[PDB]
Design a protein around this ligand. Structure first.
Ligand code: MG
Ligand code: MG
Ligand code: MG
Ligand code: MG
Ligand code: MG
Ligand code: MG
Ligand code: MG
Ligand code: MG
Ligand code: MG
Ligand code: MG
Ligand code: MG
Ligand code: MG
Ligand code: MG
Ligand code: MG
Ligand code: MG
Ligand code: MG
Ligand code: MG
Ligand code: MG
Ligand code: MG
Ligand code: MG
Ligand code: MG
Ligand code: MG
Ligand code: MG
Ligand code: MG
Ligand code: MG
Ligand code: MG
Ligand code: MG
Ligand code: MG
Ligand code: MG
Ligand code: MG
Ligand code: MG
Ligand code: MG
Ligand code: MG
Ligand code: MG
Ligand code: MG
Ligand code: ZN
Lengths: 114, 50, 59
RNA sequence: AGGGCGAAGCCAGAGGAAACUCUGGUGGAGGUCCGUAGCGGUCCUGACGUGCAAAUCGGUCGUCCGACCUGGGUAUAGGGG
RNA sequence: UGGAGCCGCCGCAGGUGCAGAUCUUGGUGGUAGUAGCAAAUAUUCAAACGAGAACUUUGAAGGCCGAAGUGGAGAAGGGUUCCAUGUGAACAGCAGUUGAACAUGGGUCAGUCGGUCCUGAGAGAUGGGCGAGCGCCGUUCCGAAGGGACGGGCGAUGGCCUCCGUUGCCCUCGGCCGAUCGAAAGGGAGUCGGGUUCAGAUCCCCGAAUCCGGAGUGGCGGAGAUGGGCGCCGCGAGGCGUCCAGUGCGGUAACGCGACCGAUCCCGGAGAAGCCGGCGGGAGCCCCGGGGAGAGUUCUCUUUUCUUUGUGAAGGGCAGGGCGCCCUGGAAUGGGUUCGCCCCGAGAGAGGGGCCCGUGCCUUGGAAAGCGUCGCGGUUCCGGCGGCGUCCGGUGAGCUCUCGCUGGCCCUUGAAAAUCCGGGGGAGAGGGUGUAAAUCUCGCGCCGGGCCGUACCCAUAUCCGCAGCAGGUCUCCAAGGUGAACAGCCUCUGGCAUGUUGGAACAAUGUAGGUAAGGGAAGUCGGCAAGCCGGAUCCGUAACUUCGGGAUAAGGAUUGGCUCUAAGGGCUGGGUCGGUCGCGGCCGGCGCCUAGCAGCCGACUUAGAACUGGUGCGGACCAGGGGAAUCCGACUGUUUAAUUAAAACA
RNA sequence: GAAUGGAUGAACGAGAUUCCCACUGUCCCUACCUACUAUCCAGCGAAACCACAGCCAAGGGAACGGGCUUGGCGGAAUCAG
RNA sequence: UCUGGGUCGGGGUUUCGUACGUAGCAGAGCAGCUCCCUCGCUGCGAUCUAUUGAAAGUCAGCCCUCGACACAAGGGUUUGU
RNA sequence: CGACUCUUAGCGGUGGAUCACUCGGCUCGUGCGUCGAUGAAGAACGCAGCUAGCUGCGAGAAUUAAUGUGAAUUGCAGGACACAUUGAUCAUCGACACUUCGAACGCACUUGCGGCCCCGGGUUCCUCCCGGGGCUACGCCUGUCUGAGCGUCGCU
């Protein structure tokens, strides 16, 4: 069996020195060094444990290269925050403001009464 | 080592140049007391300013 | 060539062009264990290396 | 490396009036056992003893998921560490 | 003998007389041609060169290392040890025609591999303080610790002073947080296939790529964006006049589409995370069945046994994984479902979708290249040129790597930063109906990427142990057989010449192995030493106990070869009758295996039975001797490097 | 003789004892075999040690002599032990 | 030249335990084909029987051969009443 | 006689005492009494036609200029030169020059990163890119400019 060697002066098997086997057109198994696994961004909410959809999970210094559309999604808070947490933020932020208005109304009635 | 600094590499180079044996025409000079280089350094025995 | 150790490829390129009225594709230096920066200098394909070699003396 | 033991949790079946209990599984815990590499260094009071060696060798041994082994970097200096 | 200076007497002067000091420095003997050149199984035949061969080289044979390697590559360290040619003085504890020796020359090529940048533990200036002082402390602390930016204004020049730059001044805004150093294994954009050398190649050549920076006048397309209204004229396509709109669109949604303005400010993410278990997917390798091409065997047998049978990165497609995403809807007779679990009115099943990874296939690359074969061209030089081939399937607690899901453990909760992006905001900017500013720009085009390292050894001969020293010294790769196995034993790939020598003998003493009649510890301080035991399956298992153990307790039986049997799985198939449309579809009616049956595949185990052998069978290898008690210390752990591993320390 | 800890105690121990079973060259009692040595040869080739040296009995003697006294006696050069 | 001793061969002796091959109606069973004959034929098949006290070794330090083959006055150093 | 051993002598080895030399030391004295940011000492790396070491020098590198001297230097080469000419070779040394570290100075010690002004290619100031040049240590004094302060006043 064809055993093989590392292709770089880094001898030690590390986070940096990860590999994979590949058959070339020359018909010799050769190590190719592999790129680290990128992660999709997690939500700005911080409770939803699941990572975001519609974003290319890639090593962050790549994002540079990528097009805008890969990096985000067409929504308010797009590619920063999961939908669920937006549509709860939305209705929360609305419902809160409706009660603030109700308390303002109850305050104004109390001033007019007194 | 195969990972040298430049400082060290240059140092080695001079050491490598110093090793050569005397030129034999030196022996024929007028007031010559020198017969052999006597500052010759073999890598296997005697191990540099390092 | 053998080149002065302080030189950049940029300088060598510029020197080779200036001295031999020539033009370079690329310079490709190393340092000899001896001390003398060697330089491999690829000339652009309009020029033949053996022709200039004969001009400068070497062959 | 590879094996052993098989802790909680889980399933079914049987009994029990209940409490719950038995039987068969599954599960894979642990400064758990055997045992390799590793780390060590018990005995032979073996070899050697102007040596291979200014402490080595051979068998035999201890330990081998943890107060584990180990590279590089870095800290502590002499009545000091 | 030697070849250039030297002495007697009278005075003066002293570093002035050696057998010793385990005296000092140098030299030389006896011991002595003595000890010694014994670790790790192994050599033999022929030839070549050559003055000369036990040792070189080539060929042939016999052997070993036996993928946890005596193989193939690095790290540190060495520093030219690398390669070639020549030499045979010295050195390589015999020799050498040899070498890591000696002498001549050669030899290390990068935007993409590393240094370089970041911060880590830490180190360390300034301010400040101490200090007789060289200095020390301190690193945010007793600091006026920002020199930057945007927008506006005013001035000055440099340019077709057009318009834009460049600078000076004025206003405007600005928290940081410590200067700096600190990693060739942490973080850290982007390079791979083929060829090429006596010695270098991800570095040279060929070919395919790629990142980052720049790109002004903007090099070009495309996007922004070219609608709609009203009024006329025209048969109509349409033309003009005039009015507004236009910082992209699609999807119920997850989200999508090639681009889709935008500052200081703010929020977030990525960089950025322990160990252990289980399960699954993907490759590399192994295996099996066949196709070819070349082999070996052929006394007999063998459709043989052996080799070999390819596609880089980057793009595009598609499987294959995963989702704690969405929509429908509403689940107890509760369901779904994992090896284990685990999930559900906070929405289960069921249906339809969305996103991520896609290292797997196909394809562009790419057959032109590589490999295998047969064959020619050339006295030569020649990287010459042609043919054919580079196929099809199947397997798996398989091993290695990897991606992924899901648990367990913690009085352990398992790095920072540089860098990169997303979002919230909406200060601004853009042109006025054919165009603009705009492209976290889409596609193409142009230019650049400096500096240093790059030879080889990496170890029973390039490192450290005074040496080619049985010592020490961090990693990657990792075939077949047997087998639980990276155990041992044998094998291929690759590698070696038995470890600083040879020959002849086979005495005593040894060192290292074995075997012994009868007895069986009578030996000896003492069962020290060696021997017994050993694997597996099936039974069987005591005292005691902290109830967990003790426990492989003890004690028993079996084991081979051969020929059979039984038991464990997957896939696919019926919608047949009638009609009609093109063996296939569509419709309607039966059927509806709903106890399933039929055909086709494929690992491997387990049990049982017959027969059989000079009772041999875990046949080598591997592999516990048990029991009863006492003392100490609960245990695992640690300890005197080099006489103490314990009852000492913890 | 009681946290200078007393008494205990399952599990564990390369810890200290004693006995039993098994097993054995431990022994009675020694023997034979193998390999590497030692041996002889070619080549190569050290060291420690060394007043001179090296046969005894007795005597005396600094009270255990190689040397002295008196006796015994004494024969080159060497090899393996 | 009692012609000899030697190598090879042959006997003898002796150790082990019956070779390969071939044949078999031996052989637990199984299979293929058919004449589905199950003693059909043909194959697989440990082992068994026969040939066969066979095969193989047997001086190198056993015994006899007088069969075959060569070779056998040769070399070097010595020593004197 | 034989070998071996012992003794003496001859000759030869081994070994380097002795003697004889001495461009070195040791001591005493005299005169002078001079390093450095205009970059010291020290270190590094370089430089010869053939040169390794010692010395000598610094990319103008076994030295340039100048002055004095007046035919060599020489291991071998080669050369020069007209040695009736600034002229070989030495000496002196006043002119010139003087790589990198170093108090050591843009900031770092990789030999890594920079900033700011000017110049050449590059542009046609388009900023890039390349190359060259000059600045860019800390402390302190005299002045200069810009400033700060509910520090002390004055005028508004
Ligand atoms: Mg790294
Ligand atoms: Mg998207
Ligand atoms: Mg060494
Ligand atoms: Mg001993
Ligand atoms: Mg000894
Ligand atoms: Mg040895
Ligand atoms: Mg004389
Ligand atoms: Mg004197
Ligand atoms: Mg004397
Ligand atoms: Mg000897
Ligand atoms: Mg190699
Ligand atoms: Mg070599
Ligand atoms: Mg020798
Ligand atoms: Mg740093
Ligand atoms: Mg569902
Ligand atoms: Mg290399
Ligand atoms: Mg190796
Ligand atoms: Mg051997
Ligand atoms: Mg040998
Ligand atoms: Mg050796
Ligand atoms: Mg016995
Ligand atoms: Mg006794
Ligand atoms: Mg006894
Ligand atoms: Mg024992
Ligand atoms: Mg027990
Ligand atoms: Mg007691
Ligand atoms: Mg203990
Ligand atoms: Mg010790
Ligand atoms: Mg010990
Ligand atoms: Mg007491
Ligand atoms: Mg008390
Ligand atoms: Mg007491
Ligand atoms: Mg005596
Ligand atoms: Mg004599
Ligand atoms: Mg002398
Ligand atoms: Zn959320």
């Amino acid at each position: 069996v064809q055993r093989l060697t590392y292709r770089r002066r880094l001898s030690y098997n590390t986070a940096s020195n990860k590999t994979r086997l590949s058959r070339t057109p020359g018909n010799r198994i050769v190590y190719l060094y592999t790129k680290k696994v990128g992660k999709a961004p997690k939500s700005a909410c911080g409770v939803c444990p699941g990572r975001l959809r519609g974003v290319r999970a890639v090593r962050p210094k790549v994002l540079m290269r990528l097009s805008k559309t890969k990096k985000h999604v067409s929504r308010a808070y797009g590619g920063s925050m999961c939908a669920k947490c937006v549509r709860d933020r939305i209705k929360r932020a609305f419902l809160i403001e409706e009660q603030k208005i109700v308390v303002k109304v109850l305050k104004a009635q109390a001033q007019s009464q007194k | 080592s195969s990972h040298k600094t430049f400082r060290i590499k240059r140092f080695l180079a001079k050491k490598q140049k110093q090793n050569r044996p005397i030129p034999q025409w030196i022996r024929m000079k007028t007031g010559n007391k020198i017969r052999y280089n006597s500052k010759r350094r073999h890598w296997r025995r005697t191990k540099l300013g390092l | 060539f053998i080149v002065d150790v302080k030189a950049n490829k940029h300088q060598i390129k510029q020197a080779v062009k200036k001295l031999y009225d020539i033009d370079v594709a690329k310079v490709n230096t190393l340092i000899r264990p001896d001390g003398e920066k060697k330089a491999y200098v690829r000339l652009a394909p309009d020029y033949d290396a053996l022709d200039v070699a004969n001009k400068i003396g070497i062959i």
